[PDB]
Design a binder for this molecule. Structure first.
Ligand SMILES: CC(C)(COP(=O)(O)OP(=O)(O)OC[C@H]1O[C@@H](n2cnc3c(N)ncnc32)[C@H](O)[C@@H]1OP(=O)(O)O)[C@@H](O)C(=O)NCCC(=O)NCCS
Ligand SMILES: CC(C)(COP(=O)(O)OP(=O)(O)OC[C@H]1O[C@@H](n2cnc3c(N)ncnc32)[C@H](O)[C@@H]1OP(=O)(O)O)[C@@H](O)C(=O)NCCC(=O)NCCS
Ligand SMILES: CC(C)(COP(=O)(O)OP(=O)(O)OC[C@H]1O[C@@H](n2cnc3c(N)ncnc32)[C@H](O)[C@@H]1OP(=O)(O)O)[C@@H](O)C(=O)NCCC(=O)NCCS
Ligand SMILES: CC(C)(COP(=O)(O)OP(=O)(O)OC[C@H]1O[C@@H](n2cnc3c(N)ncnc32)[C@H](O)[C@@H]1OP(=O)(O)O)[C@@H](O)C(=O)NCCC(=O)NCCS
Ligand SMILES: NC[C@H]1O[C@H](O[C@H]2[C@H](O[C@@H]3O[C@H](CO)[C@@H](O)[C@H]3O)[C@@H](O)[C@H](N)C[C@@H]2N)[C@H](N)[C@@H](O)[C@@H]1O
Ligand SMILES: NC[C@H]1O[C@H](O[C@H]2[C@H](O[C@@H]3O[C@H](CO)[C@@H](O)[C@H]3O)[C@@H](O)[C@H](N)C[C@@H]2N)[C@H](N)[C@@H](O)[C@@H]1O
Ligand SMILES: NC[C@H]1O[C@H](O[C@H]2[C@H](O[C@@H]3O[C@H](CO)[C@@H](O)[C@H]3O)[C@@H](O)[C@H](N)C[C@@H]2N)[C@H](N)[C@@H](O)[C@@H]1O
Ligand SMILES: NC[C@H]1O[C@H](O[C@H]2[C@H](O[C@@H]3O[C@H](CO)[C@@H](O)[C@H]3O)[C@@H](O)[C@H](N)C[C@@H]2N)[C@H](N)[C@@H](O)[C@@H]1O
Lengths: 261, 260, 261, 261
């Protein structure tokens, strides 16, 4: 009754997932429904469809990032600066709202993790080191990011029962697009440097709210409506498979046509 | 008859300015009235009362600091990033609202200027290098600032027809005071590093608005009312002379009792 | 009698070269022996084993870099400052001792060349632009170098009859290693800036002599002795294939255990 | 016969010492000759000429710093790591070859001491806390040092029968100067961190030998020969009074003209 590994492998393949692809996954475990062996089998089935020559990536981030401390009373901020642990990539837990699957992949054998705390990506497979390498602290969805590299190697994005609003790649499209105005955020973050905690200022485009009157769901819905991507069932979940290069190109043109200067 | 150099020196001495003091000036040229020789003579008369063993300092800042570029359209901000000049302490003009006297002092012979663009101070005299040295870019009114040093050497603040709301030293009291919440700002600024332009992020407490329900004029008036400072006329101007250490102590206690 | 293209491809594959790898080559043409078609066929056979989704990189440097002029009399120095040509990446010849194969690759179609004159790297393939981008003038074997990026994307080093003392990647290990003594040098170099010749000063760790009592031969031989890398014949040449990340990690530990904190 | 407090005060004033100056002293007690009350009176007379508005600073260092332990056998090194006391600024004795006057000033009432063990400075007076604050452990004669601050506040250096080779400020000139070769060292040191002994590694330019073919004696003699500073007798001692800013500028130009870019 629960979905089997073999059936999930074939369901992923039916969508168009092929040996050797680099793929970034957004998922809802509940949407897929009961799997025989639990969410590990979702990851393993996807890895098997990709084969060891492919690569699987997820957005992990950092569940406990203390980027809000300026909003606290001064005396409480002082305690955070002294007592909050730094981002340690070996232990920093994935953002829970990024799916438990991101935390499962973060702790998978042979995983690689990128160094930007807020934008941290985890990946397993042939190009996992490449995708996660040299992730700049500032503008973490920009040109020196795993999203840029995913576009460059013509990777894919799989939404597995995940809302279309959660496509992290579209923050890279926001970065690229010549828009009339984008909101810049600067926030403190503790990191490790020579094995010691250092608080640094991170600069980035706001990724919590859009820069103008749009949503990622709207961009993705328009992409699908004009023939973009493939769609199909995986377990109980509605799934969408997008080519990163074409989706990014479409999204940049979409933003610039509506909100450019 | 326009006010003379001698009459200004004498009025400065009558108010309590003494040889060897370190003094930070806030002024209105218009409030002083016509001076024989112009605003140079205000500066020179004050320097003469201080003698070369004293020191005179003003808050210059940078009139053209482009700290607002994040609010501009992205395409315009890109042009600023490419074309706006960096803070060059040799040429960066003083904020006009800090008085033309601050720009006059900034271009005075033997002046020293501190390196923080937004908070830049200029000084002439025996301790001018000391006061302006190693002015940190972040928290420019804090521990690594000319204001901290002015307090440490028990200097003075002279208000020469300037409103009591303009006492820059009270931003140092804000920095020191343990208050429930202070607003932190981070803003971009172009500077010179190894002779090349570099854009850096500056972090500071907000100095454009108070951190709570107060004004500097309110603090200063309360200080005067409880016997703080000396008052007198210099030219046509109402003048106030404050000890930096006592005013800072008072303002920190004032802030902490109300907002701590 | 001469080695054929097909036999060289087979030998590279037997050694462990795989499609998609990013590979840095050190070679001796003489050690390989006569090849049917000459040294071009060595490069093409290696590129074929790597496929277009792989990358081949070599250290080119600049045969005629005038980094020695501070030692000359002022009058001769003035002539160098006036008359020596700048580093032009389109024409600057590779160091002859880096093998003629480095000069052959530098002039190969679709090559990318990194901008640091003394440390210039040349590469052909899918990650060639990535590896050669933004190569800082200072500390050219350091954090901003193609060697750092080769480690970060988990590339490989192939020794094709080249002595183990010539592994340029070990200068990156010297840069990373925390050691009791380092020599820092500053030297002059003419470059092109806005189409004009400009003399700049480059700061780097000394790469002409070791920083302490060791040799690269010593480190690499120890690496092999503990099971590092794979070995085999390619043509007449003894070949070694090393993982860049594992060799660098080993060499940093080797240096730090003897001269470190 | 023994020099009196009053006659030292007069001699310091005749040399050019003035109220309010920040002054770094290098001294020989024997060169001054017998003082009525002993070396305390040298320090007190100098403080009196400076007044409490002035500041007197000396290089104390740490007589017992175990910065040499990497050269010992592993077994003896092990005992040092276990048993050597940490740098405690309250008790760490001044280097004996820095003059007993440095230890006398280190134990003077109201003294402030900078935190860098090897480069520790002690000071008494109005800018004593300023000069000694935030003395970084790495590059202790560099930008984050009391010597940098002495230059910035336009202080002075007084040589009181001390050899001209002993001007510690010239290590700051070495740090600033752009030079063809520098030696960088890393050495161990035990310090206090949250009241517990911790061993750290300090990185600095070598200050035990020059970076090139020069001595501080040469630089200082050349400075004096071109009119730098003021000279006079204090007690039996030849004294020199130098402006820290002018001497540092001269020394940096001297080094860069001979060994610079
Ligand atoms: C928010 C969102 C993750 C919620 O989806 P979800 O299916 O409810 O949550 P998850 O995918 O984390 O799965 C949670 C379920 O995994 C199940 N599960 C199975 N084994 C588990 C295990 N060892 N440990 C924990 N949970 C386990 C549990 O049933 C758990 O549900 P429960 O806590 O209610 O018992 C989803 O709507 C979504 O948005 N996904 C895309 C997220 C994304 O990629 N965001 C990018 C940034 S915008
Ligand atoms: C805002 C404030 C400066 C305005 O006072 P003000 O007397 O009108 O202005 P200034 O002191 O700059 O003097 C300007 C006058 O100097 C005169 N002046 C004389 N010689 C001059 C010269 N060579 N060049 C320019 N102006 C000259 C001019 O008459 C000029 O007035 P005008 O342009 O209207 O003709 C004053 O109210 C104030 O706040 N002073 C304190 C400022 C301060 O210290 N702020 C700290 C940060 S909060
Ligand atoms: C120094 C070293 C290159 C010498 O090896 P080598 O085989 O003698 O020299 P090369 O690899 O340059 O091959 C030269 C041969 O290529 C041959 N060749 C074939 N076609 C050629 C052509 N069109 N043009 C020139 N030479 C050609 C020639 O026989 C030439 O030898 P020759 O000039 O004596 O006739 C080798 O010992 C070595 O150290 N390799 C590693 C180099 C390195 O990577 N260094 C990194 C910095 S330490
Ligand atoms: C090395 C140098 C200090 C030797 O000078 P010195 O006059 O022989 O030594 P000191 O200045 O330490 O004075 C020591 C004398 O102080 C006298 N003294 C007086 N009271 C004393 C007391 N309570 N306790 C100890 N000594 C006392 C003693 O005569 C002692 O000499 P002694 O042990 O032979 O009896 C001197 O040549 C020098 O180089 N000074 C500059 C040092 C410097 O600043 N170095 C910076 C780093 S390069
Ligand atoms: N792609 C649109 C999404 O925006 C928000 O999630 C973003 C997230 O926003 C955070 O959400 C927290 C509060 O929910 C804040 O701390 C924010 O920083 C941001 O910090 C990440 N860098 C990227 C995430 N995409 C929304 N939470 C999500 O529901 C929505 O689908
Ligand atoms: N706290 C009282 C004072 O605050 C403001 O001046 C501050 C000033 O704030 C600017 O004032 C402008 C409003 O005209 C804004 O651009 C602000 O950025 C800030 O740039 C300086 N760092 C410190 C100045 N004290 C007031 N201008 C001044 O009139 C008043 O006396
Ligand atoms: N570390 C091992 C290697 O070091 C030297 O080659 C280096 C080379 O050194 C030059 O060669 C001369 C002899 O050392 C120096 O004077 C420099 O000009 C240097 O310029 C490059 N930056 C890197 C090269 N690896 C050796 N020449 C080389 O044979 C040896 O394999
Ligand atoms: N500035 C020149 C001076 O160098 C030496 O003293 C230096 C001292 O050098 C040590 O002294 C040992 C032998 O000289 C070295 O091994 C170092 O550890 C060094 O540790 C300090 N950081 C700075 C001192 N200046 C000389 N002791 C001194 O006589 C000479 O005049």
């Amino acid at each position: 009754i629960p979905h089997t590994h073999a059936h999930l492998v074939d369901a992923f393949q039916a969508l168009g997932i092929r040996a050797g692809q680099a793929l970034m996954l957004h998922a809802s475990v509940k949407a897929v429904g009961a799997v025989m062996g639990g969410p590990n089998v979702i990851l393993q089935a996807l890895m098997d469809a990709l084969t060891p020559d492919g690569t699987l990536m997820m957005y992990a981030g950092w569940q406990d990032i203390p980027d809000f401390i300026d909003s606290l009373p001064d005396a409480l901020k002082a305690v955070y600066l002294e007592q909050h642990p730094p981002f340690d990539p070996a232990t920093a837990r994935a953002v829970r709202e990024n799916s438990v699957l991101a935390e499962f992949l973060r702790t998978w054998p042979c995983v690689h993790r990128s160094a930007n705390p807020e934008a941290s990506m985890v990946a397993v497979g042939r190009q996992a080191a490449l995708l996660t390498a040299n992730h700049a602290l500032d503008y973490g969805y920009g040109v020196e990011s795993p999203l840029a590299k995913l576009v460059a190697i013509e990777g894919y994005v799989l939404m597995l029962g995940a809302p279309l609003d959660t496509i992290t790649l579209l923050h890279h499209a926001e970065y690229l697009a010549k828009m009339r105005h984008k909101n810049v955020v600067r926030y403190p973050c503790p990191i490790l440097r020579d094995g010691r905690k250092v608080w640094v200022t991170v600069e980035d485009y706001d990724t919590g709210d859009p820069h103008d009157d749009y949503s990622f769901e709207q961009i993705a819905r328009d992409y699908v409506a004009q023939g973009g991507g493939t769609r199909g069932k995986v377990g109980d979940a509605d799934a969408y498979l997008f080519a990163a290069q074409d989706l990014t190109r479409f999204a940049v043109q979409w933003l610039e046509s509506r909100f450019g200067d």
